[PDB]
């Protein structure tokens, strides 16, 4: 179908919606799931970025490049990139994207096109687990601090409509519409009203 439920339009100079976790509540995840609906005519833009707290390096970014949707992420080693290179999506029509990561593995799917897949005694036990704990962080998304929607802060402002954003249990755009305490909206971003029914 088209844009359903809570929807925002980004215009002109663009704008930003920011979710900020309270300091004691920042999550660290082994697995992530992200979905959103969008429409735009832009060849290049950033749509959503999740950043860890300052001084830490992990991140996840959903963007459009040369009219193609893609994601880039890092969870403790090298940057990893996945793109749907074979469907042009800057045609001003509604599209859906689904992204998942599970440790080192990840997938990307646009619309209904094929999924793209990327591939002793007391003391000894404690130390061995601490050493395993260390290596495990290289496939965990640590200390998530903000979800920033709209790309302006990254220098690639989005222009178009966004709806139905979901990230790890949070419907972020609905929280924005319900005046959540942890959300801020700035710039040219506007809530689309309800259908009369009609
Ligand atoms: Ca990590």
Curated annotation (Swiss-Prot):
Full-length numbering of the shown residues: 80 to 294 of 468
Quaternary context: The cytoplasmic C-terminal region binds to CASK. Binds NLGN1, NLGN2 and NLGN3, DAG1 (alpha-dystroglycan) and alpha-latrotoxin. Binding to neuroligins is calcium-dependent, and the binding preference ranks as follow: NLGN1 > NLGN4 >> NLGN3 > NLGN2. Interacts with CBLN2 and more weakly with CBLN4. Interacts with CBLN1; interaction is CBLN1 hexamer form-dependent; CBLN1-binding is calcium-independent; isoform 1b does not interact with CBLN1. Interacts with CLSTN3.
Coiled-coil segments on the chain, per record: none
Subcellular location as annotated: Presynaptic cell membrane
Function: Neuronal cell surface protein involved in cell recognition and cell adhesion by forming intracellular junctions through binding to neuroligins. Plays a role in formation of synaptic junctions. Functions as part of a trans-synaptic complex by binding to cerebellins and postsynaptic GRID1. This interaction helps regulate the activity of NMDA and AMPA receptors at hippocampal synapses without affecting synapse formation. NRXN1B-CBLN2-GRID1 complex transduce presynaptic signals into postsynaptic NMDAR response.
Binding site residues for Ca(2+): 58, 75, 140, 142
Domain Laminin G-like as annotated: residue spans: 8-189
Tissue: Brain.
Residues carrying sugar: 105
Post-translational modification: N-glycosylated.
Family: Belongs to the neurexin family.
Record-given protein name: Neurexin-1-beta
């Amino acid at each position: 179908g088209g844009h359903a439920g809570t929807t925002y339009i980004f215009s002109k100079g663009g704008g930003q919606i920011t979710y900020k976790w309270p300091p004691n509540d920042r999550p660290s995840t082994r697995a992530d799931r992200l979905a959103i609906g969008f429409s735009t005519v832009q060849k290049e833009a950033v749509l959503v970025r999740v950043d860890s707290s300052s001084g830490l390096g992990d991140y996840l970014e959903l963007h459009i490049h040369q009219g193609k949707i893609g994601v880039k992420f890092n969870v403790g080693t090298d940057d990893i990139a996945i793109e749907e290179s074979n469907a042009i999506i800057n045609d001003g029509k509604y599209h859906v994207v689904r992204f998942t990561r599970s440790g080192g593995n990840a997938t990307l799917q646009v619309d209904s096109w094929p999924v793209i897949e990327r591939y002793p005694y007391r003391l000894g036990r404690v130390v061995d687990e601490w050493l395993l704990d260390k290596g495990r962080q290289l496939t965990i998304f640590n200390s998530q601090a903000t979800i920033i929607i709209g790309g302006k802060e990254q220098g690639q402002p989005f222009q178009g409509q966004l709806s139905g954003l979901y990230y790890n249990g949070l419907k972020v755009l609905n929280m924005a519409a319900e005046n959540d305490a942890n959300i801020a909206i700035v710039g040219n971003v506007r809530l689309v009203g309800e259908v009369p029914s009609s």
